[PDB]
């Protein structure tokens, strides 16, 4: 009964059978066949052995397109004639002709509306491409319906852009440069995006707010909610997306301005113009978009399943992923339900012949994670004290696979050491690396910038279930899945991602037939779990904190020194954040020693809430600037960008675009206010490994 | 070596000799002196057996007067002439005449300025005596000189009232109504108040910042700091305080509307009108302040010894009290810090004989109390992450004495079965109960107005230093001293606080000749301190917290329902309040069942922690509204008097004068949402006692 034996009991047979069953209809949160879904597995569950299976609802704001009242685009002319609509569904997939209840393509959240007016084109809507239109190219995107590609970030930071240059609308589409890989075919016979395609997706903007009707709180039966106007991080324009069959014939009568240059140029036969407007022939025809989704109030179930500790019951491990889709959910969350459902089975497994892990594991099936996090943040709104008393670490589970050619892994410095050594303890998938360790695989495809023999492990970002336990509460957290080749391979994440063709079949014939790659995420999230929920000493390493502390410092000097003069009138130093990343440094090696040489379980478990407790340290409760939710001072889902991380957030953004403020006194003191933070924020999280008394 | 060994070694006449060390020159905060009585105290805890003794210190706003330029207060005549001026110093007690660095009466952190205007007299200046002057009497303080008396409420909140009704000033002045006792003699000869004696102390609204320049983050060598302007808590209006010989010559010449009644008039022989300006004769005379004090960043320095736990080194009970005072300090801070000196002494006599308590206890010396709780606030605020994963219990330790009578203990409900146990174990000092126990003595002379035979217990308020403990970080907190029958004594306090006349002699002559009641205090703080550190399992009841949470809710919807109609029409139900308080009443008598039925440590310990976090489950991270230091949801000091304790404060203030809102959905709403708000955190808290897992 160790690590060995939970390991060899998951099969990737049983993972293939789930992901079958969890795929056949559509599973939107909100809908009566994710509420059957919930109470199948709340069932499973308990048949797999856990000691309770409970489901916790919340009554939360979605949003839905209305079925009488479709949305869609047109190209109208001075008689108001619409002469071009866009597709009012994507093409549905080969005997999924007839399944009914397939969501047609919007944005959720998107306010309704009916604006008319010229296009502008915004390439990917990112910070800098906006920049590069007002400074430097002189378009106003005032009054303007803005066309953007998908890719590069997160929808919802290109709505907030957009809104913020003054567009009346926008349009998000998947262009061929982002959405298919070259030599491969389109569904159903290769795995890329075909042109009546359409990716689904929220563009909130909520910062980690969970419910934008309950911030703090949850969303339980006598809750207080905010009206429409107060909620938080909707958008304020319409917004809707689009195919690139449809995409082509809104772009290829653009006129105004050429494109900057070749970095705005997509994969279509049109010359890619930003406009404002069409070209001289056409310039009197308009864009229309026709937006009549409604936002409404529903009840969403998340499935907790516990699994009592035999030593220390009140210490939680938490593996937790997503089970709403926006349509079949074949790779997007099913591949990561699939694998956590086999992870239960094995660990019931083992209980039933009498086992107990030392440490109690909690074990998740969130709903309404497309949505905004909804059902994990309400969750852990609701039982925050708990959390953040006894939280040891939160493992996700969402996609198993997003390409077939490595392991990916985003976690906490403290969990580095573990992951390292739990991967040199399980078996390569990969093509010749038979016999051979995932580490030597996953070292040799991705390695390390910083170090030889290593591999490289990312900062966590957003844009998933694990964003309110890391960086609104401060519990250590982690992620791992298969993926692509990111340096040969230019397009933006998996092309078939929250589509109708992201089926069961995407997945057996095209990404992991034999399954393996799900069976290796299953070893490597349920083996992260094993040793999390029963290693006797908790397996994080501080020391590995203290190295990538230096590097971020490193980084924002960096950053800061590009402004030497302003450095120099308004006395900024970085010598403080210096000085506590060389004491954490200090203190994290003297910890160390000490953990080495000590029956006691005082001592231990002393030290093992020293540990648990590090990740707790560096929240500060009274959050970022303007979003209270981001707490955490090392770590910050990027303001450009929610999917990726950002090191020392709150000196990123008070450094960023800061050559453009209009009171640099004011903006070079505010830099200097978040270095104070953050240096005592460091040398606070050191002193808590210091001797307690 | 047992709490006996440590009460019988404590010594009244080690506590006299003591204060009588203490009091002999003022001990300001930020003045060289109090420095020196810092190294002084860090020595002889060194020398009485601490393991650590420790100076921690920080650079904070503290204010001062121009020795070259006093403040003081003129009636002027129409050509300028200033025909009366108030005192520049307090006549000093007999044989301290030639005492040196002696503080003149002035109120801290006062802005600059020489404003000349007409009186209005505004009674004690509390909220209510505002609404009567301006709904009832019609009377505008607008550009107006406002004249108060001290008493029933902490001066700051009578500034910031004066200051929202307009005033350009305020002046403070001691009526013998309420600081002359009738039939005792004024300073040398009795413990009244003379009428050249003035009361100090700092006039700011913090609502638990700490410094004014760093509020969240404690005032270290590289703290960036808030300009002036943005500082908090600071008054933007003049103030200074006067005696009732000054503040006769200002109220006698008073025209305008009559006092409105009874309550409005003290005992001075003048008319007690309200103004604005003078009578007749003497209209065209003027009132003028000249206040030239100047607020300073000045270093302060906090004492912390460490006794380590044998058992739980990681478990902190906290022995605090300040030792900086406005000049002597014989009774406020240095009788409770002779006490905290004799309890050092006392366990640090059993630990030179090998014995050590089960937990750490930590003492604390703090420093600059006076100017805003600033010392205990920025230790707190750089040890905020040891203090809420490692803070048993705060006791804290300023005047032992304000009165003879009995005993007087504020805290939280977590203490009473603690307090009440140890009472009836300790010797009353009282006349009368010769043998029998403090608690009988006690209980005789304060009986709780809920239940027979049990003594009256009271909700901790604020203005000490317990604040940034209990109401920010949720620690588990208490104080205790001797105090006067309040039944009888209709003055405010003890009539010589924080005036010159406060002195050792004070003490020694009128108030604890025999230094009995200052030796009963002292073997209940270090009673309490002794069990919280000592007990295996920690000496909390979290059934009386289910008892007072019922009290509560009774109490705030007995005040909503003074607005029937509105309940109806807005739909505001305390339903879920009750619901649950109902719930924590029975998951609390669950928890206390199996608290009684457990040899395993991590079980013992697992429900230590759970009794340990109890308090903590109470805190909100969002704060109070516009009070984001004042955490705690159950307990907040009151937005009309910062010394009082507020039950339910968030709803309390919602429904605070609800009746004069120009929106009334708007305010219900908020009442709803603060219902909302504190049935969720006590259901949340409640849960922190459910079975783990
Ligand atoms: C004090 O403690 C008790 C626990 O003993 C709490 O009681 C809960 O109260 C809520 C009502 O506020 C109940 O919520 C209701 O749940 C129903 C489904 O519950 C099932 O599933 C749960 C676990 O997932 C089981 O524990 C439970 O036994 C059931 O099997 C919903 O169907 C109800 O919603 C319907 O009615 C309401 C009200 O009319 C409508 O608004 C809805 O639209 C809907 O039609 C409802 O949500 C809950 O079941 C109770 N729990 C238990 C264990 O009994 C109190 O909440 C607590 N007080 C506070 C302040 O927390
Ligand atoms: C990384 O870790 C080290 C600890 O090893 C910290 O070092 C401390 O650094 C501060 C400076 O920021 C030092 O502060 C100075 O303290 C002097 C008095 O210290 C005495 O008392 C303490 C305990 O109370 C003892 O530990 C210490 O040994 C001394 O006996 C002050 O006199 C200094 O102030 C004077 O100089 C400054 C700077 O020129 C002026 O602005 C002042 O006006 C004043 O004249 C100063 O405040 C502290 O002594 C150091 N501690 C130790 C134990 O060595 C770093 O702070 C830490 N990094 C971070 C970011 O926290
Ligand atoms: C693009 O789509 C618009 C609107 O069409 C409507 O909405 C879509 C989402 C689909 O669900 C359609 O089935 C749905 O009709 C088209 O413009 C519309 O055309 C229709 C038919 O010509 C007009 O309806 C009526 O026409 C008859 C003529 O006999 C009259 O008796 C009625 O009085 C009424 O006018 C309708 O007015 C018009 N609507 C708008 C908003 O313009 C458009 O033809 C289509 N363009 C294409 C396919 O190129
Ligand atoms: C109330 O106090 C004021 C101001 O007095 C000054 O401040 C106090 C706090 C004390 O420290 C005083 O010692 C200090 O002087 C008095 O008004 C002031 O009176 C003086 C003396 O009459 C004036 O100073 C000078 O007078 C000589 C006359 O020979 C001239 O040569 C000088 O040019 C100069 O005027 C001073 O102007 C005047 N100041 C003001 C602000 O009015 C006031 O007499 C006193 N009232 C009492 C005791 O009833
Ligand atoms: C995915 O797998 C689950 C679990 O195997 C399937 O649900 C299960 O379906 C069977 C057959 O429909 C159910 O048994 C039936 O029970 C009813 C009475 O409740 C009875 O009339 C039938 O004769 C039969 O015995 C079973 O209840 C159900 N189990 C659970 C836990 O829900 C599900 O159908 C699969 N879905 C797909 C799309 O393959
Ligand atoms: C990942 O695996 C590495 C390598 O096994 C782990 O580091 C090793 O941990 C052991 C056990 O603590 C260390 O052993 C100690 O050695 C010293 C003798 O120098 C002795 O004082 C102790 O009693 C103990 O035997 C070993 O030194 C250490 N090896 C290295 C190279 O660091 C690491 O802990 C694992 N990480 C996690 C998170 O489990
Ligand atoms: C309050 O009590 C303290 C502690 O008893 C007194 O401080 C102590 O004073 C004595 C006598 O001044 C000091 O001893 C002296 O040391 C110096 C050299 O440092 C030497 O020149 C003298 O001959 C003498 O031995 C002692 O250092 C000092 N102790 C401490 C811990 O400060 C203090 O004077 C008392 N204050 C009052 C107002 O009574
Ligand atoms: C203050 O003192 C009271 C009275 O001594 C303490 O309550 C008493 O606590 C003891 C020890 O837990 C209880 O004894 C238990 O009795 C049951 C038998 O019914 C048995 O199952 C247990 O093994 C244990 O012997 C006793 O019942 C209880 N008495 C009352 C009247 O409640 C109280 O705990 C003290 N408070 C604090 C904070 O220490
Ligand atoms: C979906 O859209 C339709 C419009 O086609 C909405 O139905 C109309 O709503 C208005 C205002 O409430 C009524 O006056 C009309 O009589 C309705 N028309 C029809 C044809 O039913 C409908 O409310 C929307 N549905 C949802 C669920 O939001
Ligand atoms: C105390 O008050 C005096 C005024 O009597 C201040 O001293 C004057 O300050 C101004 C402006 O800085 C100078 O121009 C004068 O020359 C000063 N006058 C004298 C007589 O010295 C003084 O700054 C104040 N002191 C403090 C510590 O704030
Ligand atoms: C863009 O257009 C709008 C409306 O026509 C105008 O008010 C706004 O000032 C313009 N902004 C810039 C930067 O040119
Ligand atoms: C699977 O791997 C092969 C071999 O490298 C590659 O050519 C193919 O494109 C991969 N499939 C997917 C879906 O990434
Ligand atoms: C009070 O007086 C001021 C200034 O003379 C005036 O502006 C203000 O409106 C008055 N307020 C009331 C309530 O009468
Ligand atoms: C001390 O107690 C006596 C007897 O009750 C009382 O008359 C006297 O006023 C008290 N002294 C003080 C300072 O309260
Ligand atoms: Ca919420
Ligand atoms: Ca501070
Ligand atoms: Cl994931
Ligand atoms: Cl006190
Ligand atoms: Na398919
Ligand atoms: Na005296
Ligand atoms: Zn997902
Ligand atoms: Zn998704
Ligand atoms: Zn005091
Ligand atoms: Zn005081």
Redesign the interface.
């Known amino acids: 009964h160790n690590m060995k034996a939970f390991l060899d009991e998951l099969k990737a047979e049983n993972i293939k059978k789930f992901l079958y069953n969890f795929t056949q209809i559509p599973h939107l949160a909100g809908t009566e066949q994710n509420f059957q879904l919930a109470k199948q597995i709340q069932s499973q569950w308990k048949e797999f052995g856990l ?1 309770s299976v409970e489901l916790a609802h919340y009554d939360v704001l979605l949003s839905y397109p209305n079925k009488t009242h479709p949305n869609y685009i047109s190209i109208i002319n001075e008689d108001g004639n619409e002469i071009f609509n866009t597709s009012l569904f994507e093409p549905p997939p080969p005997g999924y002709e007839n399944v009914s209840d397939i969501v047609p393509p919007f944005s959720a959240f998107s306010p309704q509306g009916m604006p008319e007016g010229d296009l502008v084109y915004v390439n990917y809507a990112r910070t800098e491409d906006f920049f590069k239109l007002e400074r430097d190219m002189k378009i106003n995107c005032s009054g303007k319906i803005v066309i953007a590609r998908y890719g590069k970030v997160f929808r919802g930071n290109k709505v907030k852009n957009a809104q913020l240059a003054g567009a009346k609308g926008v349009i998000l589409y998947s262009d061929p440069a982002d959405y298919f890989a070259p030599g491969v075919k389109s569904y159903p016979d290769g795995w890329n995006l075909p042109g009546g395609g359409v990716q689904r997706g929220n563009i909130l903007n909520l910062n980690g707010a969970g419910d934008p009707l309950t911030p ?3 969303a ?1 039966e ?3 909610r905010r009206g429409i106007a107060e909620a938080v991080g909707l958008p304020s324009i319409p917004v809707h997306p689009i195919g690139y069959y449809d995409a082509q014939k809104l772009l290829e009568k653009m006129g105004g301005s050429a494109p900057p240059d070749s970095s705005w140029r997509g994969s279509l036969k049109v010359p890619y113009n930003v406009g404002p407007g069409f070209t001289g022939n056409f310039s009197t025809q308009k864009v229309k978009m026709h937006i009549h989704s409604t936002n409404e109030v529903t009840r969403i179930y998340n499935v907790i399943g ?1 699994l ?2 035999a ?4 210490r ?1 491990v938490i593996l937790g992923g997503h089970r709403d889709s926006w349509v079949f959910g074949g790779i997007d969350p099913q591949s990561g339900a699939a694998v956590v459902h086999e992870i239960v089975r094995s660990f019931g497994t083992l209980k039933k012949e009498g086992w107990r892990p030392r440490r ?1 594991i909690l074990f998740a099936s969130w709903d309404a994670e497309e949505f905004g996090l909804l059902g994990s943040t309400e969750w852990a709104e ?5 959390l953040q ?2 939280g040891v670490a939160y493992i996700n589970a969402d996609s198993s696979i997003e390409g077939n050619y490595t392991l990916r892994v985003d976690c906490t410095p403290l969990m580095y050491s573990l992951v390292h050594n739990l991967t040199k303890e399980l078996k390569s998938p990969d093509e010749g690396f038979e016999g051979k360790s995932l580490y030597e695989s996953w070292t040799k495809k991705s390695p390390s910038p910083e170090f030889s023999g290593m591999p490289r492990i990312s900062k966590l970002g957003s844009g998933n279930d694990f964003e309110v336990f890391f960086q609104r509460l401060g519990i250590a957290s982690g992620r791992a899945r298969y993926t692509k080749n990111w340096e040969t391979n230019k397009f933006s994440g998996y092309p078939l991602y929250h589509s109708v063709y992201e089926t069961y079949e995407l997945v057996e014939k095209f990404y992991d037939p034999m399954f393996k790659y799900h069976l290796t995420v299953a070893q490597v999230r349920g083996g992260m779990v094993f040793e999390l929920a029963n290693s006797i000493v908790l397996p994080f390493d501080c020391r590995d904190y203290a190295v990538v502390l230096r590097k971020y410092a490193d980084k924002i000097y960096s950053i800061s020194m590009k402004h030497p003069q302003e450095m120099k009138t308004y006395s900024v130093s970085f ?2 954040l210096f000085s506590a990343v060389k004491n954490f440094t200090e203190i994290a090696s003297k910890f160390s020693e000490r953990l080495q040489d000590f029956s006691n ?2 001592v231990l ?2 030290m093992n ?2 540990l648990m ?1 590090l990740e ?2 560096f929240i ?3 959050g970022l600037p303007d979003r ?1 939710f981001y707490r955490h001072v090392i770590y910050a889902p990027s303001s450009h960008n929610k999917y990726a991380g950002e090191s020392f957030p709150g000196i990123y953004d008070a450094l960023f675009d800061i050559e453009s403020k209009v009171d640099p006194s004011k903006a070079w ?1 505010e830099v ?2 978040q ?3 953050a ?2 924020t460091v040398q ?2 050191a ?2 490994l210091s001797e ?2």
Not at 311 to 314: I, K, L, T
């Open positions: 000691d703090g709180y949850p339980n006598y809750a207080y516990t009592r500790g030593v220390e019951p009140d939680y109690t609701e039982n925050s004290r708990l008393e006894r010598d403080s379980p005082i478990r002393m809430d020293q407790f707790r340290a500060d409760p009274l209270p003191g200097k206010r270095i104070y933070v240096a005592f606070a999280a002193e808590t307690v008394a």
